[PDB]
Amino acid sequence: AFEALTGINGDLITRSWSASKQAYLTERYHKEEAGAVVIFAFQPSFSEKDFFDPDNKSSFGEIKLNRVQFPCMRKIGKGDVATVNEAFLKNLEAVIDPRTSFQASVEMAVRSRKQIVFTGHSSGGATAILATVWYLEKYFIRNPNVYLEPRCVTFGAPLVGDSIFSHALGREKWSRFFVNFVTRFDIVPRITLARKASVEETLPHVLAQLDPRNSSVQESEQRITEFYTSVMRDTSTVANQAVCELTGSAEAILETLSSFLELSPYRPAGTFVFSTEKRLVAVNNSDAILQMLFYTCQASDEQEWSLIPFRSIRDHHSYEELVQSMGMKLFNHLDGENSIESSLNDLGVSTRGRQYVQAALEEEKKRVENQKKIIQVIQQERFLKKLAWIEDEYKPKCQAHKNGYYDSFKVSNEENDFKANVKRAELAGVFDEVLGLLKKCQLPDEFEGDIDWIKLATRYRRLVEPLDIANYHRHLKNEDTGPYMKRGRPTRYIYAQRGYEHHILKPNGMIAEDVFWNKVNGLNLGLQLEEIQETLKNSGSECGSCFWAEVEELKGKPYEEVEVRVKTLEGMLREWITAGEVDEKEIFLEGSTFRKWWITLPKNHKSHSPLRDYMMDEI
Amino acid sequence: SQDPESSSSLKGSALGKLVVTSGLLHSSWSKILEIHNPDSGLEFQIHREEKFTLVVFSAPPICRSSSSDSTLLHVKDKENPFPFLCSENNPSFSLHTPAFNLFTSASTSLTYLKSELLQTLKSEKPVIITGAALGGSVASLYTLWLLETIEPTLKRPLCITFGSPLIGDASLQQILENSVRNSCFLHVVSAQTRIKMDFFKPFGTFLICFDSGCVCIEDHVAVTELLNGVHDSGLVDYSQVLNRLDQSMLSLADSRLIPEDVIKGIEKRAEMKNLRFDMMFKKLNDMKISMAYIEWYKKKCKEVKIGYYDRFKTQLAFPSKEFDINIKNHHKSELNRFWKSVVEEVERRPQSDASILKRRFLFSGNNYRRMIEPLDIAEYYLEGRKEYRTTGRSHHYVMLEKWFGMESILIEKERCKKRDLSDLLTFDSCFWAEVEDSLIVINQLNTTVGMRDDVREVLTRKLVEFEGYVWEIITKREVSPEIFLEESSFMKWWKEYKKIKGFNSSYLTEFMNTRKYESYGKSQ
């Protein structure tokens, strides 16, 4: 029942562990070729430098990922990039270094259609996690084969990424590739949950004790105990904060306290398997795992408290025993259990701790339910009719009046324009409601990647954002508040755009901003790139459904003042039309704001403009 | 036996442990120990740490007989240091006299300190104010004072008190219940602590400490149930209290520190607060949708030459169209429901929080009133009621006009001097009441048998008054052109007024007879 869930068998686990051990004896990494499988095991490190980077000035040695090298590791709508341990990222960087032959070997394995596996013990496991993401970003997303699917298997690995990191893995459906084995008391997966200042004095001694090759430094009772106590204290604060935050209650007092709290950003990423003498417990839910990382490493009696710190060290060296006794242990999948009491009791989880775990699991079930409700709404006839009416009745009628539905809405002279406004408002309510759930993380991680949602939201944005732009300028909000693109654009449209852009661009490895700016310089304006970015700051030309926002901002202005923005808008137009972002039946109409304004442009521009053959001047 | 712990019980536990393991209580109490021992007035010391700035307050010993001695503070009182803390519902509240007297007698050095602290918060460096017993009371008063004009974007200060007596009364409790300020207070008390709560009431969050752990209670009703007694208990040694909390963290005691029925209360009130939200995000969109429907309705009534005022009134008297019925029963009622609640919500918040909420609904509230109050007027007079403006206006309409009817009216009229007025909502939202009143005057003059000649002269003056009123708003372009729609109650008024005023002429008379109104409200 373990293999049909994790997608890995006892054979791969055993080979991964063997390679993980062998990695101790090599530079950076060890490659093990096992027939159809190629395993890359990474050398662990036990210096404090390799857990908290010395040059890192943050309280947890954390750093934001570069959006260029890890474009998927971010929130799509919100934009926020993921955060990882800097020391671990530097270690990955050191092995990707061309001189190590690591990348060449990876590419050799890809061409051979071999099953690629990344693995490691301790900090080596942390490197494996980052290497897997690197592989997923560089190769798998570019050509997703069943042959290209990696596997990541770790043993006693430190935590690596933050909640966004975990979220992004989930959205891309990459989380399934990750399995993290944790012996019950192992302190190493808990370490980075502590402030680096909390363990700055005792970490070097403890790491020396954790090092399997270091039987030199004499064991110290005091240092190990202080270390365990420090890690558990900070861990409890993180876990308790997560408890209060997950249920959405007491947001006021928590916000007040947030100014005075330093909590670790690091979160479980991928499946975690907790191990005891008699049990293997697999958990998928990151929130649930976070709680378990605290409550599984507690004392049973109050007499055992003196023993636990030493067991937290020894359990890091008990993965040999884990791997050898795998088939003899009882397995269960916590998330799928009808009752989680038995599993967590063997993991020594208290009654209160079990309820915290249960709440985390229930919250995910809520998110699934919320998505089901959304599907029911957007598939209803009464909902779809609103979009259909705009598309099949309102737009053609406005085209027949020769001014278009943007201009018709803006002046709103007829009952149909007021009817369009109602449907604009009603659609806004439904998409704002979805956005609200997303902002509060009350939908599954995969939601923004769901192609059915992306299809609908894209259809919505292209159809109705022009109307919301019209509404904005109709009520002169451009004069009161300012430009639509700067202070007026509804977040729901921004989410829709980014969800769409990510979907279509990510198999080609480029991001929207890069695609946009590459096209701008291709227009041959000759000006300095730095100068043009200043002019195109908050331009409506980055998104086809913002066509009208840009037109509004450019009309009325002298030509010299906004010459650059004009030629940019013209250069984006045909692709916008081809992609369906802009309707060609609308913008060139006689009564169209765009057409009426375009004619008033200087004749020198119109002659060699690509739009000359699509509009004729008046007489 | 026992049944599994409730949701709220687990929150208070986790929040309690979070506060304990945070080290905030320890660092606060240790600095408190320093100020009492390395004439008897208020004392304070400022600790400027790396993470934050800590201010410790120290006061003379608590006088027990002055337990329920209170000082009343009114918004009208110029000697009230907290005018922005008063609300419309509660224009006054009461404070513990010894605490308040210590606070005011130190107004000089506390004003100097306020400069530094506000500047500290501006640099996004958080601030803690703390004190034990009566020092904690003054510390709380000082925190309330800092929050009086503070920028809501800045990080909120945190006030931590240890074994402090109660500070405010029911009035202040009710105010802070509707304020962000309430989340700036952490009152640490021993579980053995009892307080006579006959006059003074708890506000803020309470951390109740047991030997085996602690729990955060925000529900002031629960705090009352837990801490109210017939005797004010003395100050305990919180050095020992915190010590037992540290030993609690390494304990396997998941005991339920809070009684069964107390939890029942906290939950029931929690669920009722999750609904008192009125979803000012979701319902907010529901409002815009209903307003959009009204605007659609208004356009349709215009095109059939009746106007939405009279069409509404007509369908109210004789319902025959489903669309019109839906407009009244759902969309109008939804808008009335919303804006009444908005008015109520503004009135229960302290002026500081209320002013923010008022700015958010300035324009939209003004637009709602001018759009919808006409419809309530239609119903009012259809029901045969009289003198709407002075005797019949719904409270929320009056408040909305009171708040929003003076500022935006200057900028909007600026635009309505060159622009077309087709979409203009009549500024005087009681316009139609004036029309209905004048119609009543005319009917009295026409039908009342044996009316005295002096009474007739009075009513005739009313007619002239209304005509002057009408001509004024027409000339100032402050009325919707839709009043001239041929089936409207205004055009009926004119027809009836025309018959009764006879051969005399006026500016309005020529305006109507030459049909100059057909060119009224055009661009220029």
Ligand SMILES: OC[C@H]1O[C@@H](O)[C@H](O)[C@@H](O)[C@@H]1O
């Ligand atoms: O079902 C397993 C779950 O694991 C989580 O880590 C992911 O975020 C979810 O998208 C996924 O559904």
